Amino acid sequence: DHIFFEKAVLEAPYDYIASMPSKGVRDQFIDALNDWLRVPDVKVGKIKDAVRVLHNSSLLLDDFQDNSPLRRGKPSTHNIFGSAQTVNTATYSIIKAIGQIMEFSVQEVMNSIMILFQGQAMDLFWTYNGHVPSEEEYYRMIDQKTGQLFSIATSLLLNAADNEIPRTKIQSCLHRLTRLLGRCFQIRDDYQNLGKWSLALIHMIHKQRSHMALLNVLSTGRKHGGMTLEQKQFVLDIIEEEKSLDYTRSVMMDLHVQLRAEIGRIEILLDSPNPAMRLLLELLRV
Template identity: 50%
Template sequence: MAVLEAPYVYISSLPSKDVRNRFIDALDYWLKLCPETVAHVKQVTDLLHNASLILDDFEDDSPLRRGKPATHTIFGAAQSINTSNYTITKAIRMVLGFVEPARALEILDKIMSLFQGQAMDLFWSYNNHCPSLDEYYRMVDNKTGQLFCIATYFMVTELPKDVRSAQMLLERFTLLLGRYFQVRDDYQNLMSADYTRQKGFCEDLDEGKYTVPLIFTLQSQPPNLRVLHILSIGKRTGKLAKEQKDLVLKIIEEAGGFQYTRSVLADLYGRLCGQLQELEVMFGSSNTDLRCLLELLKI
């Protein structure tokens, strides 16, 4: 068992802001669930999140995770994938053992959505296909948003039926939080010195990932052959030179891609704050923990 779980133990040990568990605790301020339920929700979320990180790093050929070697560079691809599959199965077993069957199936549908979102992300990168921004946001809602939604939905299933009127508003807030979280990550990957230390310099460009700054640039300046050819080279070689990345960053800046992304983040953040106010009115109390979490993520 130690051999099987070693890759998971490693990825779990890496430093993290613990955003998802802080989000769960903040929701529980309103929902007031029993400690056992909250512990189950956190465990399922942690299992799914860390398993997805192991798979993401291997599928993206990422050498680093949070400033440390990625799991597959230590344990090998085969062992890492096997542990990830085991971990996801373990999470599903926990859901089935804790939630009534009909609700459990809905949670499993959300887990399946994680893979659908990742499939589109990988497809666009592998085929050097630039999605529309609407397509990109739908992918994010599945890949990033659903992990937050799984926690929210899991918690709401424990509520009395007359309190579940908050479910739809909570799920809208949660999806929006996932979207903000991912667009923020896109921006930080290309602009943050701290992110460079954690994941490497503009790693998304090495992977040929289509993110908001890049999609906006390519759609506002079609066809930008310099960018497309540089991304193609990165996919073939597995890594771009600093000078190639600097050129792409310059093109994005001149096209207004970073300014546009900052405006998207500001809009999403404003909407999150507005929905948080609605939730506070619905539950009859302000939520300091949730407000602090939003402030932590603000750019």
């Protein structure tokens, strides 16, 4: 009656970003995963819906301060509803997502979600206090979020997997695959400007030599809550001349080698070749 109006208020900021183009690597991963596990279409639908809400809510919490517009006539959610409403809808949406998950123990599910916020905590902490994460810390952070969200999807699918697949023989390789895939996806994605960092930027800072100019723009942007368009150009130009993108390409090639090995290992564990998964891996390049 009047409660439908209240719900419409509560979910208005969510419905806003939920209409944006997703560029669904995650759903393509779940589809590829299900070519092995063969979970009923009805179930993977709910699992997709669950992790999407989880992913969308992550974005709302991430971009609740963002002022830059999303599309042509679509401002940031913050520029429609303000920070407070955005944050409140986001927190509610996560809890609703967890409630939806509880249909497919309790403490285990809660812990899996909470790891995501452990990851975000480190990312936020480092950003706010001006720490450039080492490559090792960068990876651990990715594992606790982008990799973790991927892991949640994998676990839910394994739980609802067809009765003719051996879950215990496969759970091992499946999560090693998931962790490496999320890392590969995140590294690839952070590369597609040149997240807040990149493998190139991180390596350049920590590897060798003085780039006083670079240290100082980052501090400048940090003081201003981000860098301008010119400053970003400047940082890209430094990275391009130091040949630091070549390091990223080296790591990714090795990452594909590790991942192609994991897939074949699983393809042999089951009697199922997975071109879809190998296809997805091949499209996460350079």
